[PDB]
């Protein structure tokens with residue numbers, strides 16, 4: 040079994056700690072770290088690598104990501120490079136990915152995933168408890184898109200379709216590595232692509248619950264990620280999903296108190312940013328949207344406005360964006376960001392303020408209404 | 417011997433009349449009194465329904481108009497003090513209840529529980545109810561906060577609903593309050609504060625009944641109550657409490673889910689209203705406040721700022737207000753309003769968003785630190 044840690048900007052100590060756990064694990068035959076460039080961190084892990092291999096009897100390799108796709112060169116190139124390495128330079132039967140920066144990692148993540156693979160599943164995804172105001176891309180972009188475009192499939196039921204923590208069977212990794220839609224997704228869209236393509240190909244999926252959760256400012260920290268996750272859905276929108284898929288999830292535990300009691304973002308800063316980086320093109324682009332959204336966002340030039348951006352207004356908005364949004368156009372990018380920000384604020388003030396349980400319940404029903412709306416049309 | 421009082425203004429007649437019926441049917445209630453603000457629609461409906469309710473229940477149901485007994489805005493204070501005057505001068509009943517006209521959860525239990533605690537010996541019985549984490553912002557940030565910073569060694573800041581209009585007094589407590597000029601003059605929203613304070617100051621023994629079943633717009637809706645409740649505390653600040661008081665509270669149930677999952681105010685409207693109705697004198701009055709507060713509120717001329725207004729900034733702010741605020745002055749009232757608004761927003765986004773239990777714990781701890789800070793000094 041190969042374990043992969045993609046990294047770029049992470050501090051060395053956290054990645055090295057995780058490497059040491061994975062290398063020590065009885066079922067792990069090799070650890071690979073993949074980075075962007077030979078920096079301080081990359082050199083540190085290269086230096087520390089041989090002490091770790093001798094101590095564990097497990098080979099630890101470092102490699103650079105190669106340019107395999109055609110978008111911004113980010114996470115997708117790293118993961119796809121790991122797929123090639125696993126397929127062409129190893130004979131291991133299974134590959135795990137874990138983000139380099141997870142601070143809650145332990146032998147349990149590896150064990151649970153392997154045991155699920157033993158059971159027969161082609162793909163094992165880890166999922167985690169999350170704060171009511173985390174996962175706003177997952178919820179408002181990815182799962183929403185899946186519900187609205189493929190309501191009869193497993194896609195919108197997957198818990199963490201953006202999660203980078205997962206295990207694949209060799210054959211699943213080969214299928215993804217060979218798929219050109221996946222190979223080209225060199226940016227933040229890679230996780231969406233892996234998720235979508237595995238489901239479309241009827242790979243069987245198990246979702247393991249990891250109770251400790253994943254420990255790793257304004258909403259604008261997420262803006263590139265948001266743009267690329269949305270572009271990934273938009274790129275897939277005319278695809279057909281023609282076959283069922285086995286999909287099961289470990290029953291989740293009660294959310295831990297310290298996770299239920301996190302705030303996901305700085306509300307003040309987010310309100311402020313909503314009023315910034317406006318341009319006449321952004322103002323003119325709003326003429327594509329429904330009346331309450333156009334007026335709501337136009338208001339945002341002067342003061343934060345977001346009550347208008349409820350569930351149905353968001354679905355209406357999502358449809359216009361699927362049709363008109365252009366990845367790489369700066370005004371479209373900023374507009375998406377503002378529109379999503381008003382959706383996040385609306386949900387924060389009218390749903391998340393009512394409590395964790397209330398929020399979870401609203402989000403699941405949101406998907407249910409989106410699927411039903413899409414299935415009736 | 418027991419009188420039940422419902423002061424009223426513009427409430428819907430059916431809620432009030434339902435409650436009147438409940439009170440008069442109660443075996444322990446000898447007379448029901450309704451005190452009307454003026455001869456409006458509500459008052460006419462009450463006066464029509466009265467003689468029939470007296471006949472159906474064999475209990476006298478009287479209607480009267482609030483008199484002008486105080487020297488401030490003619491409001492709740494006049495209404496309640498008029499009921500005291502009547503209880504004392506035109507009846508011989510030994511106990512008086514007050515209930516708000518529009519409580520929708522009213523039953524004989526509210527009366528029985530209060531009567532039973534008086535039988536036990538208490539001078540004053542106050543009811544208290546579960547409340548949502550964004551309700552009771554005057555109670556917490558103004559009244560309980562003031563009680564904690566001004567009389568930390570007393571029972572005052574430990575009282576759960578000092579602003580609550582659901583309570584029972586023994587005749588001698590009522591007489592003492594009616595006779596007190598500080599109380600007689602508080603014709604506005606400050607009356608509840610005055611009742612709570614003077615009873616404690618005079619060593620009246622207090623019991624708090626828990627009513628499990630008991631209990632919109634921008635913060636704007638609470639602006640008049642806010643400025644009058646603050647003025648009430650300000651008007652008492654040099655008073656001394658030189659005797660203890662017996663005070664016990666019924667143990668509270670877990671908050672009902674339907675109450676934990678409410679929202680208390682329109683956030684968007686509140687953020688907007690924070691940027692309005694500036695005057696250059698308000699800008700200049702800010703010069704009296706600490707630097708982060710001065711800078712923070714000044715920013716509110718252009719965008720909402722509130723992160724600065726944590727509990728320590730609020731305590732510093734409260735001291736400046738106690739010293740400088742001018743009741744009845746439009747700029748001072750408006751500044752208090754914005755100042756409290758930033759405090760409620762700060763608490764909403766950094767505390768209440770973390771969940772009900774986190775919020776409750778934070779609030780009780782806040783009073784704890786305010787008592788400690790005040791007693792040390």
Ligand code: NA
Nearest residue numbers: 062064067097
């Ligand atoms: Na090993």
Ligand code: NA
Nearest residue numbers: 440442445475
């Ligand atoms: Na009676």
